[PDB]
Design a protein around this ligand. Structure first.
Ligand SMILES: OC[C@H]1O[C@H](O[C@H]2[C@H](O)[C@@H](O)[C@@H](O[C@H]3[C@H](O)[C@@H](O)[C@@H](O)O[C@@H]3CO)O[C@@H]2CO)[C@H](O)[C@@H](O)[C@@H]1O
Lengths: 524, 26
């Protein structure tokens, strides 16, 4: 389904209760006439920033909060602003998870933490310590059983152990340059993990489905997983319980804790409808219950419902494990940390590197263009287009507006203050190109040469508008010459967009992104 | 040849600064 006024499209990961949500959707449609479509696309968390940066994607995106800081800093999520009576219905720490630079950028739904899940018949009392698991496994393989199987393919699952004795991602006001994935406690935890594998107690190939089948068939005594998984266990009839993770070197396993959150695409035209559905249909007792029946959510943010749920021993264990871990950061670098630790675990586990070589790759890779260019080009394109219509030029693909939500306001403000600048300098600009004497062979160096000399002494929002008006005029001038066609129009639009992504994106984000632009130049 | 470019660029800078100064307050 495509974005469409008067309808909602929702993206949510395939392990959640999407059929229960769909039923809330149906009820909404019955009561209001508005159609809700729920989808669960593959790799949705990597697609969203690619397609949102071009004006596409869902109205509402569901994911844990660690991904959203990167999206918001790119301008892809709309700010959220509920009434006090509603904010008060949910727990405050869940709102803190979705606060990025003072702005709430999503609705918190449920608190998620890994717990140890065990087969009460084959392990009637579960181990309290990681270290005692190797002895338990030889004891169970004696019986054609295993002690423990969990997903070694996603770092989420192994991180509680890596963190236990001192592993950390970013030092806390977070220092990009102090990561801590190659400290001694990290090396110690991943060594335990890799030793379990080399000593034949786990298989480095094991993944989500292999572990679930194992446990729900009765072939392994334990697994590590979140509340979404309880539903399939109940169907298996296995006699299980849910409890606190084991300790490593005397200290708790420290899981990175996620808050399932619903963010609203900054390109959506249904922002207000999305909010009142979430607040009056999802975030009630009857709404969360419909989803919970499909796949358990965990510890819900909604006070009135969690007070019943809390009496389930499985939720008690969820919250115990959550208090021993850390709420994940939401910052943009979280992505590169996870990717770096993915490779390091996978490589140490398989055997292609030592721990010391891998976690030292993870250290450098954890620290430090095209996607931002596509962002900027939307803005650059709306403004070059208008200047083209102003001169009477008809250029393919620069016909008509059709702007989508974020750029509407930005475009408006940019034209207002841009006309300010050149109205006060009508001669200089009208003769600008007759000075330069551009040609196909001198065009690129002249464009760079001048742009660089604008900014050599420093940057401000006005030097950026001056720059955007220069490049726009440069473009219109290229369209005018029969030896430089419509081909030079998109070409110069690209020069401008890349120049911004390359040379100015840092300053622009430091001064607040386009929302800062909107406020600096705001009216009356 | 290009020192014209330097002239043009110096002008664009001063032009941009004027715009910023006209909006320092809201
Ligand atoms: O490892 C590659 C992978 O890393 C990043 O994914 C992380 C998620 O951002 C993070 O939330 C967590 O994901 C878990 C969900 O919170 C949880 O509800 C449940 O659905 O399982 C998830 C783990 O499978 O951990 C992962 C890292 O393992 C990054 O965002 C991805 O783009 C990337 O593919």
């Amino acid at each position: 389904m495509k974005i469409e006024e008067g309808k909602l499209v929702i993206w949510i990961n395939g392990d959640k209760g999407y059929n229960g949500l769909a039923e809330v959707g149906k009820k909404f449609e019955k009561d209001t006439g508005i159609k809700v479509t729920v989808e669960h696309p593959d790799k949705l968390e990597e697609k969203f920033p690619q397609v949102a940066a071009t004006g596409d994607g869902p109205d509402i995106i569901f994911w844990a909060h660690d991904r959203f800081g990167g999206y918001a800093q790119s301008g892809l999520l709309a700010e959220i602003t509920p009434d006090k009576a509603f904010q008060d219905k949910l727990y405050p720490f869940t709102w803190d998870a979705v606060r990025y630079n003072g702005k709430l950028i999503a609705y918190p739904i449920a608190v998620e933490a890994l717990s140890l899940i065990y087969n009460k018949d084959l392990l009637p009392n579960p181990p309290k310590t990681w270290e005692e698991i190797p002895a338990l496994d030889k004891e169970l393989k004696a019986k054609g059983k295993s002690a423990l199987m969990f997903n070694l393919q996603e770092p989420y699952f192994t991180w509680p152990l890596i963190a236990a004795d001192g592993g950390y991602a970013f030092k806390y006001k977070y220092d990009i340059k102090d990561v801590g994935v190659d400290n001694a406690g990290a090396k110690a935890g991943l060594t335990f993990l890799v030793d379990l594998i080399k000593n034949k107690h786990m298989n480095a190939d094991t993944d989500y489905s292999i572990a679930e089948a194992a446990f729900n068939k009765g072939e392994t005594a334990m697994t590590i997983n979140g509340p979404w998984a309880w539903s399939n266990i109940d169907t298996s009839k296995v006699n299980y319980g849910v409890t606190v993770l084991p300790t490593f070197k005397g200290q708790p396993s420290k899981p990175f804790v996620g808050v399932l959150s619903a963010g609203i695409n900054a390109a959506s035209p249904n922002k207000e409808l999305a909010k009142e559905f979430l607040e009056n249909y999802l975030l009630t007792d009857e709404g969360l219950e419909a989803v919970n029946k499909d796949k358990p959510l965990g510890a819900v943010a909604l006070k009135s419902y969690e007070e019943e749920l809390a009496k389930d021993p499985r939720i008690a264990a969820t919250m115990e494990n959550a208090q021993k871990g850390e709420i994940m950061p939401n910052i943009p670098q979280m992505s590169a940390f996870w990717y770096a630790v993915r490779t390091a675990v996978i490589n140490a586990a398989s055997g292609r590197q030592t721990v010391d070589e891998a976690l030292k790759d993870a250290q450098t890779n954890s620290s430090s263009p095209n996607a931002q260019e596509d962002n900027y080009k939307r803005i650059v394109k709306s403004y070059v287009g208008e200047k083209l219509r102003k001169k009477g030029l008809k250029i393919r693909g620069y016909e008509g507006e059709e702007l989508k939500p974020p750029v509407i306001e930005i475009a408006k403000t940019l034209q207002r203050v841009g006309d300010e600048l050149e109205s006060a300098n009508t001669d200089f600009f009208k003769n600008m190109c007759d000075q330069l004497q551009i040609t196909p062979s001198t065009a690129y160096p002249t464009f760079q040469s001048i742009a660089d000399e604008i900014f050599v002494s420093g940057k401000n929002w006005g030097r950026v508008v001056a720059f955007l008006t220069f490049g726009g005029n440069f473009a219109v001038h290229c369209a005018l010459r029969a030896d430089m066609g419509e081909e030079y129009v998109d070409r110069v639009v690209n020069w401008i967009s890349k120049y911004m992504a390359v040379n100015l994106d840092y300053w622009i984000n430091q001064q607040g992104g386009w929302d800062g632009f909107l406020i600096f130049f705001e009216k009356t | 040849n290009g020192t014209v470019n330097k002239e043009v660029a110096h002008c664009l800078k001063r032009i941009g600064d004027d715009l910023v100064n006209n909006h320092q307050l809201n």
